[PDB]
Structure formats: structure tokens, C-alpha cells
Enzyme design. Structure first.
Site, PDB file in Angstrom:
ATOM      1  CD  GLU B 255     -39.772 -30.607  33.141  1.00  0.00           C
ATOM      2  OE1 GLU B 255     -38.774 -30.660  32.394  1.00  0.00           O
ATOM      3  OE2 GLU B 255     -40.539 -29.604  33.218  1.00  0.00           O
ATOM      4  CB  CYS B 284     -38.305 -38.144  38.118  1.00  0.00           C
ATOM      5  SG  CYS B 284     -38.037 -37.224  39.651  1.00  0.00           S
TER       6      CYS B 284
END
Lengths: 460, 466, 465, 450
Positions: B255, B284
Site C-alpha cells: 500500500e 496516509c
């Protein structure tokens, strides 16, 4: 090649024969009254035989590999294409449906059949976790067994096949009881198609008999695991009691038609709303009530009436015919009564076309309110009422007054408003701003419907 | 009652002990530079032992009922509540996170733990029919085995727990390699919490070691069935290469953070957008680019810069502090280089903040272009670029310019237009008109990630075999 | 149509059937007799770039069509499969050197994949999710990835290409295929002809045949493809994996890697079943490297196995009676010769050794083999097998699980409960109990759920009202 | 404090007395001692409960999943919190043994915990369209109001089985409990949910004279669904009222049946006897054994049956407790008689002492005897002789649950699949999110043309 002959013969317990009731049924064209064919009616013993045979041969059908059962469904699609005109011609002559609506009915049935062919591959049991040490729980998904299907007079072929094609594909057997006016498109034709498609004998029977004798017994019989009916509310309601009332308790799947509201909000595209209403109500696939916001109402009524006057009433065999004959005298008498009842209840007649035999021309009423029968009860014909709505809240109240809502529609250029309004409707579907297997019946719906689950826990 | 002590001990192969690498890691506060703890690092024997032990004890864990495994997860939630402040304080001290962000991280991690408790009961095998006579197909859904989790420095606790909690609940064993700057937050504390909650010994190991020694071996190792990483793109690239490049091949779940576009169209509510953008950037769930249609640009830029000035740069322990210190000097140096290059590349300085030790104040630049580095490369700090878009079509090109898309946002009063725009974005997630356990995560994803299918076909009848 | 396809050497590049501009000519040869099938003008890097760019350009219009329209093309493709049945099977035999029996199997599998894929488009579903935030709704849209790059192997080129191509296309993706140099026809080129006849729009399906040196890495490194797919050898697959993540642009890779697959026979097995299954899977179907037998049945298994194998008939693949045909290429063959020789000197007991004559390599069976030996550890793609003796059930499990990598497996025992318990402990994705480890309607492996997960992606859009 | 004023009924969001003006005595089956007294509710009360449920439900459904889940979580804490109090009420009211009462408590607690996760899992869908510019959205929403008819057998657990998921999924609920067990009929469940922070009006309990309000509950227009688990005859009746009435109502019907326990020749005999005794007496109506094993099984079975204590339900040792009510006992005594007249061989007969009915075992039962064929609500069991497996299958088939004992699992599973039962246990579940979400939510397809 040659068109099917001897359609009067009944598929009973694996053979094509006459029924033993001792009475003849005439099958007639609603348009000109011409005799299509004659059927020797079936008695109660005929019914018992068909159910028994279906029960006997079903396990071997279920035992086949999924590809084998799918092969039959694919082969039926192939017959639909070869006998396209023959199928459409039967629907027009027997049911009185226009060619336009017969073609739509052909397409719908073919699509159901193609969809069903994929169902065997998609059936799946489950393996479930257990807290008990050494215990495995397995859920097996298998066919119910025998399904009894009651057919309506309205859309016999498509609505019969909607149950028949998935039930058969998923390893069941079927027995069908068609309406007395439409035995051929009621499953006699479907039975011939499935036979040419290689369906083993006995899996599909059709019982055409006097409703006095065989009526309740069809539902009460112990053999069928499930009884399905799509159509009229009173008919469905009766099927409900016979199911519960009987010595045996039977699962029944009932889809009951209703007065379905078509709502036009103030910001709607007028021309588009009018076209959609006309296509929905008269040209058809429903719509039984049209509710318009007060600011749009007068203009909607005028334009709607103008188009409706243009609609061509005549011989249903023609491609240009919009409105054709009512299927039987009983339905006609009912619609004429609703017209007269509308007048007494004080609905304003906007357009009244002449009744000519079974041809009932469009009838439009205005100034309708929620309490009037034309608003409350379902209509199966070219009669429709126009309601005035004060505001959006009033439009919602009117739309939900129907209570029983199979379908609905809402028109407004603001999609956000339309969707928010649609969500408050007490209906199973709403179409927003609609211009003239993916939707509605689905494989997940069918698999659940025509299979059952057996939980088997295994302790090591 | 008492907070955890002896945090310097590593959970290795079912025991709490020192590493045998012979070297010590210092863990210090980014704010004042005060020393939090020292850890005897782990060597490559430690890693092998940790993986081996996890593989050995994992079967017994999987063999427990869903209820037993769920019971551990529920108790972890209770510890999260009783040790709330202890946890938040550790996030602030070790990572340099503001108390405001620490509280969010705590809540996110707690929610993951609760949800995961429900997952074991939802896992389902399937039974299938066969065209072959006498053949039945059973598919069993089981835990992968051992999962290797690499934790980032950004959101150590939450991002670790997002992998750890579901994987453990679904019957896996886990070994975690935390970032060198945040070993306690990246699972040393979590192992203590899970241990308190009754997780059997050996299911959860943490390996704190020299990136030279343990780094490649952790990914290259034959034991782990899956390796997960959330964070920097270059790091993820490295992990990905070693995974496929190594002798042993495993699935890897990467990710990777990217430059995420925040788009304000012409019709947007200006006041809401500005506040959303400010709260967004100043992570994030990143916002790295702000793109505004030409009509609003000047108005947006003015309001934005001005709220930014209001943000206080200070001690992260303070509840009122908006902006805090950078995690380490090297990250601060990269940001300082990024500010330098921006001027170099022709960006207009709208706002320039002072750097005071690790405390780096907001920097806002304007008139940015797609070719500029501030637009195209990922930023992990309080540096933002504002881009001018001539029309909606241009804004779409600008947004889809970034190579990596993970999140995005679109602001417009016309929902139909906004959603239509959003559907064109090269991004996994888009927020419409919102300040950026029902979104992503969820059981379906977790079950897919940390379980696998084992097809077992059983033939009950003899076969001709032409 | 009636007439067979001609000019099979033309490459479908960016919506046009033309020759490649590489200036190098590739000769396709029959592995049996060495005869020339056709000649191909190879593709250069510019051809590759154009094919990818076109695929990206036309893909949205293909996706924007309805499910029924896309499904129609796949229904028409099955249609072509039937008309050109023998034409297809002949191409498989001539180019790949596959036996007629194996070629028929390949044809059927490819046809079934194509027909199953036609049902996939209507089953795609997005999601609507509830929010704690007042007035907030989450809508998840499920769409095609875009362009899929498909690398196809030489073993079962047609079937394994179609296994990616048919579902990807059905779900609205575009595809570019890089086939093996030995089997370009039964790779993308025959399938591209079939799909064109079935009415697939031009540009959605390109095939790039080029020298592995220039365009090899570039195929995987390229920025447009959202996914790269490969099934075949571990060494090749490892390469693809490195280039993927090693490269500037990062994409998903789906690697189905061939491995040493364990075939286990426990003491209570139905011997005739076990023997028949082993012979037929190892020789005549495959597309099983280590056989592990409990000590009690070992000697009995070896005797019957060797006996049947000696009967296997080695010859011209066009013959219906031929069990074993030629190895695909010279490199492949003389990898196999090395494996045989290495087995001998590692001390494997040679049970049966057949004569090699040209490309025709006869079966070779070795006995008393151990886990450390190369014949056990490494995958072999050819008629070479090793037999392992297991002292008990526990030893059989250990020997089978030494492989690490478990794509498929098989276990034979009359005790079904015990067989399953053993199977559950196997480190494999699939185990077959009392049958050949051979895949495949939607019943196993490829199915709509798998296909939709692989060839679509999710876009979460949260809306604040 | 323990809950007090338990006589009060939660009606239209107010706890109060019934309007009917009739009083019900609730009494312990063991001692006959009076537990408490309730004012019965009239038909005006029932209309109010449905009206209130319908009005307050939208606000509850409009809340986020976390809010509704939070209530469910709190209820779990209460279940632990008042463990002894709840267990005591079960023993007291229904006459359940302490062993059986604890199981009921544990089961109910698990249902409540399960349901807290349900709000998060409910999904709509987006479906593809052939029509250009058309998007199909399907929204999942709560039914509305659900009416639950509760039995007296396992009142607490079977009530919560409907209440908890329905409430969690944003529905409102009205419960009409059995007259013998009004408290464990959800009168008590209502206090727990109230203590757990459930908004007022969502959970109503109407205890009234069965004559007046009986049919009116099922026929009422408001409830979208009615749920019932209990007797076939009682449930069967509910069926007609549904389709008999002017409006048509969805009904979910779980009807009890004669469940067969089948012992094949190769079965491990010890497990068969132990499992049979544990199942029937320590809460299966008929036991079928293959000829070879029949006699040995019959011998050992009555041995263990002889050993069971019939006593006061409060005692942890008490295996068998009192029958709940006088008909149940008199019908139980009548059923014994007609097996007597129909020629079943009584292996063991226990003495009836007041409500306490000791075990009764019969042998050589046939399919055509009422004991086998017709459901039993007490400690009476019949043993049937099977010549072969084929005969054993025919016996079990003629008859909800089932069991098969055989040391060959493949054989056991083969047999089980041929049983037409919903569940089979081999040598020894439903509920779950999938079933619950489908049951208590509905789908609305909305097509949008752009």
C-alpha cells in the site's frame, strides 16, 4: 421447419394424450372469435399422475452434471430463435396481445432461458466454522424437488418461463396450471420447446382442467415443495388461503400486481414525461396512476390526451397497432364497470374511446383522488387516472396511498431530489427519468428460490 | 494499574529477552532529543527462531474455535481503554505525533481491534458440484500461516494493528519488523497488549534489528506466506523486488503512498473547501496537491494561506498544538531540500514558516505546474503546492498527472458533476465534499487478504481414465 | 466461413494486420519432422508501444458498451470454435508437437472457458455502504482495469492464453499478448483471428511476436498495462516478477508458477486406479513430477507403473494412437537429457529408460529417489518421473511437503476420511483425492468470482449530501 | 437492585398496567407459589404499541451503524451483569432446570453479541445496465416493525433470536409472549434493552387475554413481518390469519417436529446411548436402531434413564424438572395411554409426582403410532426396530433436526443427505449474519437515467 401440430394434446406423466375429464375446452381468438383449437380437459386423476411422475423422475435429473442440465437450456434458446415467428404468432392469436408486445414477450422469455443456463454452475453449498472441537458443519444446497406453477392470463409465456426455466435448470421438476383462456402460451408451447431441447419425459407436465375440480387440489397436493403464482391480487389471495388452509403446509411464492404510481415533479422534462407515460401505460413493457405536481398538471393532461387520441386501436397482428383486444369477456365487463364507477365517483372524463367488441379503446380520467377505486385498485387494461398534487409532500402521500406497490416512476431534472423522493416510496422498484438477468429476477434470487439448504454437521 | 516497564525486551520465539546482535538501538524523542529507551538488537538467528516458532505454534491457534480467538481480540479492546493515555503518550513521545493526531490513531487502532473480533465467525468454505460422475468438490478457507508485517514510521501503531489484528483473529501467526525510529509503537507495545489479552506465546514476535542484517532476510525468508507493507514508494519498491527477486516467492501486499490531489471546481463552496484542505494536510489519507479552477484560485489561495498562519507550531504534548516536529533529521533535510528546489523551479512563495530544530512550520507555494517536483513527488511533511486550472478538463489532467493514486477529493456543489468527475480520477478512493469501520478495511477485504482457499476434490467412484 | 485461415504470419498490431518492422524473420517449424509451417516478420519496440497505446485508446468505448453486447462476441467465438474444430486441433499438433489426444483436450478446455466467460459481464457488482457521519453515503464502483498484458507459455499455449484473454475481454478490458517464440500461432495469432471473426472491435486484441532480447523486458516494464499475467516455469516467472517491481512503473502481477507436484499413494489405495491415474496424468495430458508411495505398496506400484509405461506408444503426434510425441524444442530436450544423467549419478535406481530418437524422447522412470536429489526438488516439463519410498504416512507427508511450492497435488486411499485429513495438511492450493490432478463449467478454479476479482478493481466514492 | 415492578408492561414507550381490566397470575410450576401478577392488555393497547413502533422506528433507522451497535454491546454487559438474576427467572417461571437455564442464558448472550456486528455488514449493490446512461442502485433498508410471537419452551433465548438482529438492523419490534412465561417472554428482555439505552417505543410487550388480542396481533396492518417458533398446530393457525385477513402479511414460521435419532449397526454404542440420553432428557422424539444393535442399545439406554434424578429445578444435580403447565402434563399422560392402547412395549415407566414427570421409554414402536408420528413436548421417547439401513431410512423419512450414528463417516453422510430434514448431526449454525440480514431487511431497486 414444420410448425408444431396437435397442440391440443396434454403432456401428462411423460406422455402426450387427452385428459380424461370428459369435457372439451374451446380455445378462441379474442379479436375475430375464430377457433384456434380444442382440448379434452383433465380430471383430478390426471393431476395426481403428473405430480407422481414428476416426483419419480426428478432425482435422476438432479443427479446429472451441471453441464448436462445447462445443455437443455442452451438448446431451448436455439428453438426460441428458429420458431420466433411461430411463438410470436401464438401469443397474438391466443392472448390477444399486440405484435409489439408479443415481440417484447418473446425477447424476455428468451433472455430468461439464456440466463438460466448459467445457474447450475453458480449453485454453491457452504462449509462453516464450529466452536466444538473436531466438528465440521457442511451445508448442502440441492433442488427442492417438484415445483407447481400457476400461470396468469396476462403475460402467460414470459411469466411461466420466468419460474419454469430456473426451476428446471437447478434440478427441479415442474407441473404447470395455465389460465383457461391461454393454455398454449400457458406452458403447452413451452413444454413442446423443452421436449425438442432434450428435456427428459415426465419433468414437465401441464394440467388443463375445470377450476372447480382441479383448482384447489393443485395447491393442496402433498407432492409439490413450492407453489408459485405471479398475477392478480384476488387470485393470489385465494392461493394463499388454500395453502395455509390445507392439511399440508406449502411454501408459496406470490408476486401480486398492484396499482403502480407514476409521479411527475414540477421541474420534470414535460415532453419526456408524457412519452414515458404513454409507452408505460399503453405500449407497455406497469403504470396504473399518474400523479403530477400542480404547476405541471394542466399542461401534462392536455399533451397526454393528445398523444393517447393518436394511439391506433385495431388488429393486433399489425406492427403499427398500439391497443388490441381484451383477452376475455369477464375482464372486459370488469373494465367497463370501472369506467362507469369512475364516472359516479366524480372523476373528470378527459378522453373516452369507443368499445368495439373485445377492442376497448383508451379511457383517460382527470381530477382523480386517492380514495377513488381507479386510484386504489389495479387495472389490467387501457384505463388510467390523472391525480393533481399540491406539492412534493402531497405527491409522496398520494404515491404511498396505494400501499401495494410493485413498480413506480418519478420524473424530475434534479436527480438528487428524485432519488431522495424515490427512497421514501414504499415500492420494490422505482425508475427515475426513464427515457424510451441484469435487473429484477437474478441468479441469486432464483437459486435461493428454487433450492433448499441442508445443514450436516460431522463429528470426527 | 502500573504502566508497562522493561519495554527494551524483545518478544522472540515465545520469550521476552534481549537480542544477540550485540548492538544497541537508541530510541529518542524527536522534540527535545531525550532518550526513551535502548534496545539490544536482534540478529539473523533471532529472526529464524521467530519465524520457526510462529510456524510451529500457529496450527494450535487455527485449531481453536472462532469464539476462543475472538475472545482474545475483545480483551485487547479492554486494554486499549484502560491504557488509553499510556498509549497516546507513547505515540507522542516516540513518533513526535501531536496529541490531537495521537488520539485519532488510538481511536482508529481500537476500532480495528473491535471489528476484527467479529471476523472469525464470517469465514466460509464452499461445496461445489462436478461434471465428473461421483466427484464432489469441497473448498476449505484457512489461514495463510505466518504473516510478515513491515511497519512504517508515519502511523506506526494504527497501521501495524490494521494488519496484525485481522490476521491474528483469522488464525494466522505474525512477525513484525517495525521502523527503527518507532519500535515501541510499531508492535512492541501491541505485543504487550496482546499478551495481556491472553494470546498464546510465539504467535506474535517483533524483530528490532540492523536494516543491513535482518532487512532483506525478513522478506526473503521461506516461512512467511504473505508480507505486508504500508508507506514510502521507494521502500515498497525495494520490498517488492526482494520478494519476487528472492529464491523463495511469496505474495506481497504493498500500500504505497503517493501525491494525492485535492480538487476544487468552480462552483464549490469555498469556505468548506478551505477548512477541509487545512484539516486534511495540516498522513496516509494524504493531501499533497491542491488544484483549484481559475475563477476561485485567488480567493481560495488567500483564505487558505491565512488559516495556515493561524496554526500553532509547538510541543506535541499540548492539546492545542496543530503542527509538531519531524520524526528524524534526514526526513527534515529532505523537506528543506524540497522547499529549496521549489523556488528554484519557479514556485511563488505564498507562506514561508521558520524551521526551529525539528519543528518545521507550514510552507505554502503557489502557481505550481505539473512538471514541478513539489507536484509530482510524494511529500511527508507540511509542504503544499497550489495549482491553477483553466477549466474542469484541465483540472482532470492535472489530477491524473501523478503516477501513484491512492486517495483523492473533489469539491463542487453539483453532486452529479462532482461524482462524474470523481469517476474519471485514477484513484482507489475519492471524497466528495467531505473533510478527508465502514470505508475499505471491512471483513470481506480482511478475509480475502489473510485466508486462502484449498480445493479438495473427492472421487467416490472408479474412473475409466481413457 | 468454409475456407481455412491464411496469412497466419500477419500480426494484429494497433488495429491493423501487418508485418512487424524489426527487420528480423522468425520461422515456425514442426517439432516432429522439422518442416517449415510459416514465416513471421518480427515486431520491434515501436510496434509494441503502438499496440499498447491503441489498446488504451479504444478500451473505454468497449467498456462503455453493455454486458449483453460484450457477451455476444464471446457467444460468437464459441460458434467459431465449433466450425473450425479440426483446423484448430491440427494447428496445435503441428506447431506445439502435441498429440492428437492432448490437442482435443486443449480444444475442449478452451471452448469451455470461452463459453463460461460469456456469463461473467452481468455478474459484476458495485456496493453501497452506510456511514456514521450524518448525510454521508459511500458508493463503490467496480470497473475494468484497462489493459492487461498476457504472457503465454509453450506447453498449452491456446488454452492458457484463452484462460486470461476470454474473461479479461468479457469484463471490458483490452489485452496485449506476447506468445512463446516456438508457438506464436496457437498463442495470440489464432485466437486473434477467432475473436475478429466473432466481431471484436479492432485494437482491443494485439499480439506482439519479437526477439526476447529487445522487446522482452519492455513488455513487462511498459506503463499502460494495469496487469501482467503469466503461467509457466518458475525461472521465467521469477524474471517477470523482478522486472515488474524492479522497473520504474509498478503493476500487479498474477503468476501461476509450475512446480514439482506430489502424487501420493497410501497403503490402502486402489492400485489399478492409482497406476492408471499416474500414467495418464504424467503422459498424454499434464499441461506431476514426484510419486510418493507407502513402503507396503511401493514395489507393487513400481512394477505395474513401469509395465504400463513400456506399453506407451511413442511416435507421430497426428496419430490418434500416439501417447508420447516430440519435445517442443532442442533447448528443452537437452535440459531433459541433463536431468536424466544427473539422476543416474546422484544414485537413482533406473526402473525404465526408453530410447531418444531425434526430438522423440521416450519415458524415463527412476526409483528409490530421495528428497535432496535434483529429480525430487526441481520441476521437470517432460516424460521423466521419480518414485519415492515412504516408510509411513508421516514420512509421506514430509516428502510431499518438501517441495515448498504447491499448485496441485493428489492422494490415493480407500479411506476417504484419512485421505482428506492428509490432504488438508498438504501445502498446496488444490488436492485431488483418488483422481488425476487435472483442472476443469464454473465448478472449479476459474469461475466468475475469481475472474471478477482478477480483472476488475474498485473505486470508493464517498458523497456528502 | 434486582429488577422490580416486573408486572408493568412496556406499551407505546410507557411502562404501565394493561387497559383490559383482567389480572393474570404467574406461578412457579414446581411449588405452585405465586411469582407476580399482571394487568392484561386490551385491543386498544395493541393498536397503540404498533402505532408507536411505526413512528419512532425511522429515527432509530436513521442513526449510524455504530450507534445501534453500541446499544447491543451494552446489553451483553447486562447479561453478564445480571447472570444469576436472569437464570433464576428462567428456573422460576418456565420450570427449567438449573443446567438447562444456564444453557439458555449462554445462548441468548451469544445472540446479543453476534448481532452487534450486523449493522456494519449490511450492503446495497450497484448493477450494470445495457441502456446507455442508466445506473441501477439497490438499497438495503430495515423492514419497519416486526411482531414476534414467543413460545414457553425456551422463551428467553428464542425471543432474543428475533429481537436482537431485528433491532440491530434498524427495525422496531412488538412481542406477544406465551401466557405461561410472560417475564422470560421479553417482559424482562425489555428492561435489559432499556438499561442498554434502547430508545423508548421501539420495544413493546403486550400480555393480554388470548381471546381478544390473539388474531388481532397477526392481522394488524402495521407489522411488515411476523415471526413465530413453537407448536405446529399453533403456528399453523397463525398461517391462515396471515392470508385470511384483509391485508397480506409476510410471516416467518419455524414449526417443531418429530426428530429422528438413527443408530446404524456399525455405530459406537457408548456414544449413541450417551448422546441419546443427553439430548432428549437434558434438552429428539424418536430413536431408530438397526436390528443387530437394538437390544444392546435398549438395555443400556434404560439403565442411564433409571439413573436420572427427577427433582427441584433449582438444584444443579436435577436432571429432569417439572412440566410447565397442566394441559402439557395431562396431554403427556394421555399420550402415554394411547401408546399403551396402541401396543407399544413400555421398557421403563416413571412415577408422576405432581408436576414432576419421570422418564417414560417405550419399545417396538411403529411408524403408524401417534407417539412416533406426532410431536412430543416432554420426557417420553419411543424405540423403533429397523431390519436394514433401507428400513431405517424409511422409518425416519415418514415423520426439523436429525442424527445418525455410524463409525463410517462416508456412509453416515450418505444416509443424512437422503433424510429430508433441515439439519442432521452425525456422531454428535443457522442464525448468522447472512440469514439475519436477509430476514429483517428489504431491497429497493432504483434505476437512474443520466
Amino acid at each position: 421447419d414444420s410448425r408444431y401440430t396437435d397442440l391440443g394434446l396434454q403432456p401428462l406423466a411423460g406422455e402426450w394424450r387427452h385428459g380424461r375429464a370428459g369435457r372439451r375446452l374451446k380455445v378462441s381468438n379474442p379479436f375475430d372469435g375464430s377457433l384456434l383449437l380444442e382440448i379434452e380437459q383433465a380430471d383430478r386423476d390426471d393431476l395426481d399422475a403428473a405430480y407422481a411422475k414428476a416426483a419419480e423422475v426428478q432425482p435422476a435429473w438432479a443427479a446429472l452434471g451441471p453441464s448436462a442440465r445447462a445443455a437443455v437450456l442452451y438448446k431451448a434458446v436455439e428453438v426460441f430463435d428458429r420458431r420466433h415467428e411461430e411463438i410470436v404468432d401464438w401469443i397474438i392469436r391466443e392472448s390477444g396481445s399486440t405484435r409489439l408486445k408479443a415481440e417484447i414477450e418473446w425477447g424476455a422469455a428468451r433472455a430468461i432461458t439464456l440466463e438460466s443456463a448459467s445457474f447450475p454452475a453458480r449453485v454453491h453449498g457452504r462449509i462453516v466454522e464450529s466452536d466444538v472441537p473436531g466438528k465440521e458443519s457442511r451445508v448442502y444446497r440441492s433442488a427442492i424437488g417438484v415445483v407447481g406453477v400457476i400461470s396468469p392470463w396476462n403475460f402467460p409465456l414470459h411469466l411461466t418461463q420466468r419460474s419454469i426455466a430456473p426451476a428446471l435448470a437447478l434440478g427441479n421438476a415442474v407441473v404447470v396450471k395455465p389460465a383457461s383462456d391461454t393454455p398454449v402460451c400457458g406452458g403447452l408451447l413451452l413444454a413442446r420447446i423443452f421436449e425438442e431441447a432434450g428435456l427428459p419425459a415426465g419433468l414437465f407436465s401441464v394440467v388443463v382442467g375445470p377450476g372447480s375440480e382441479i383448482g384447489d387440489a393443485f395447491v393442496e397436493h402433498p407432492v409439490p415443495g413450492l407453489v408459485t403464482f405471479t398475477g392478480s391480487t384476488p387470485v393470489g389471495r385465494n392461493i394463499g388461503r388454500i395453502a395455509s388452509g390445507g392439511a399440508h403446509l406449502k411454501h408459496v411464492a406470490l408476486e401480486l400486481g398492484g396499482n403502480s404510481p407514476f409521479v411527475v415533479l414540477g421541474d420534470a422534462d414535460l415532453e419526456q414525461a408524457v412519452s414515458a407515460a404513454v409507452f408505460g401505460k399503453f405500449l407497455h413493457q406497469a403504470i396504473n396512476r399518474i400523479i403530477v405536481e400542480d404547476s405541471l398538471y394542466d399542461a401534462f393532461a392536455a399533451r397526454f390526451v393528445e398523444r393517447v387520441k393518436g394511439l391506433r386501436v385495431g388488429d393486433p397482428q399489425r406492427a403499427d397497432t398500439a391497443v388490441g383486444p381484451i383477452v376475455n369477456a369477464r375482464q372486459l365487463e370488469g373494465l367497463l364497470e370501472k369506467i362507469r364507477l369512475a364516472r359516479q365517483e366524480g372523476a373528470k372524463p378527459l378522453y373516452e374511446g369507443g368499445v368495439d367488441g373485445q377492442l376497448l379503446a383508451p379511457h383517460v380520467f382527470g381530477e382523480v383522488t386517492a380514495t377513488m377505486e381507479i386510484a386504489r385498485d389495479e387495472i389490467f387494461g387501457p384505463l388510467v387516472g390523472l391525480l393533481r398534487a399540491r406539492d412534493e409532500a402531497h405527491a409522496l402521500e398520494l404515491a404511498n396511498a396505494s400501499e401495494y406497490g410493485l413498480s413506480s416512476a418519478v420524473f424530475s431534472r434534479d436527480l438528487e431530489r428524485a432519488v431522495r423522493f424515490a427512497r421514501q416510496l414504499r415500492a420494490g422498484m422505482t425508475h427515475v427519468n426513464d427515457i424510451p438477468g441484469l435487473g429484477r429476477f437474478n441468479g441469486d434470487w432464483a437459486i435461493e428460490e428454487f433450492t433448499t439448504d441442508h445443514w450436516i454437521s460431522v463429528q470426527h
